[PDB]
Amino acid sequence: GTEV
Amino acid sequence: SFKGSTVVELMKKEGTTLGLTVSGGIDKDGKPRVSNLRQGGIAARSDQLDVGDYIKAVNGINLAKFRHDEIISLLKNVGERVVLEVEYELPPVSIQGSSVMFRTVEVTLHKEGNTFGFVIRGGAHDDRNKSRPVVITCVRPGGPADREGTIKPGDRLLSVDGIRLLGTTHAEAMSILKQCGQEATLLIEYDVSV
């Protein structure tokens, strides 16, 4: 996943 | 499975990220999901989100048909107000048995950053498949609930300053905790063996  | 749903509003700060890690997308194995919450971040400190939550929509935009990278672009370009529509696995109902007994305890807590440092899930619903007691599913380490030390994940929230939560929805229970003042006495139900 990717952090925002 | 039957899911609970909730709406989470996060205020984005000018020079920072939300501390919210998102996995999934149509091009991925799973649907859009909270896969991590950075310690002390905006998302973690909301006490409204948990790892494993599904994100159905951001700002009224349904996420399911987006590829992963498109979801990220969306989240990185939102203004200060982020509105997440969240779906979650319902908390299992604990039932009194031969080996399980329920007890209660009053817990007083003071707010910090306008929250008590715990996440609630469940609540009354017209669809009895979704209807649940209000369950405290997480207690954020270092937060008020954690410091006082009594409340544990799995405990039920029964009342907030004598206002009982029976019959109240998730949204209603959240409002009762929001319109609470800086201090509150909560009635907590918990499991005891034998």
Side-chain angles (χ1 to χ4, degrees):
Chain A
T2 316
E3 188 172 36
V4 297
Chain B
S1 71
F2 293 94
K3 300 287 203 309
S5 23
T6 189
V7 172
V8 183
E9 173 175 319
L10 302 169
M11 294 306 288
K12 218 184 207 182
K13 288 166 191 178
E14 284 163 19
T16 197
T17 65
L18 291 161
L20 168 70
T21 309
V22 179
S23 65
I26 47 160
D27 57 330
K28 301 292 171 172
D29 288 327
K31 306 211 94 179
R33 214 185 179 178
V34 182
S35 68
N36 195 81
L37 293 161
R38 181 175 292 270
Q39 177 189 326
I42 296 158
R45 293 175 178 277
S46 68
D47 300 314
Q48 273 170 97
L49 288 166
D50 194 9
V51 172
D53 288 351
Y54 294 96
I55 310 172
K56 117 179 267 283
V58 184
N59 293 17
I61 301 165
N62 291 310
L63 259 38
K65 289 194 183 192
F66 284 122
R67 293 169 185 275
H68 180 76
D69 287 348
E70 293 159 358
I71 292 151
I72 304 307
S73 297
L74 197 164
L75 289 162
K76 283 185 176 179
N77 285 292
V78 172
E80 46 187 3
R81 204 187 169 198
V82 195
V83 181
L84 306 168
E85 289 173 59
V86 163
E87 287 191 355
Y88 62 88
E89 228 61 87
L90 293 163
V93 193
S94 183
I95 54 152
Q96 303 193 55
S98 55
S99 71
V100 184
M101 177 195 168
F102 296 168
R103 287 191 193 276
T104 62
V105 59
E106 304 197 9
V107 178
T108 309
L109 294 175
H110 198 95
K111 283 186 179 178
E112 170 213 78
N114 223 255
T115 63
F116 289 115
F118 63 79
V119 172
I120 51 155
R121 291 297 159 84
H125 204 285
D126 286 335
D127 187 344
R128 281 174 89 195
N129 291 298
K130 294 171 168 161
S131 190
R132 287 305 190 270
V134 179
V135 179
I136 294 158
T137 58
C138 313
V139 178
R140 181 165 48 82
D146 183 58
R147 285 184 290 159
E148 189 280 341
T150 314
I151 295 159
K152 296 306 174 203
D155 295 351
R156 279 73 69 195
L157 183 57
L158 296 183
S159 43
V160 177
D161 291 319
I163 303 168
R164 298 208 81 88
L165 291 199
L166 198 79
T168 66
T169 64
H170 190 261
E172 280 167 355
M174 281 300 293
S175 290
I176 292 165
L177 288 159
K178 272 161 184 161
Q179 291 308 304
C180 196
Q182 291 312 108
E183 207 149 66
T185 299
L186 314 165
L187 187 66
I188 306 304
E189 180 198 85
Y190 62 96
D191 298 357
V192 185
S193 174
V194 175

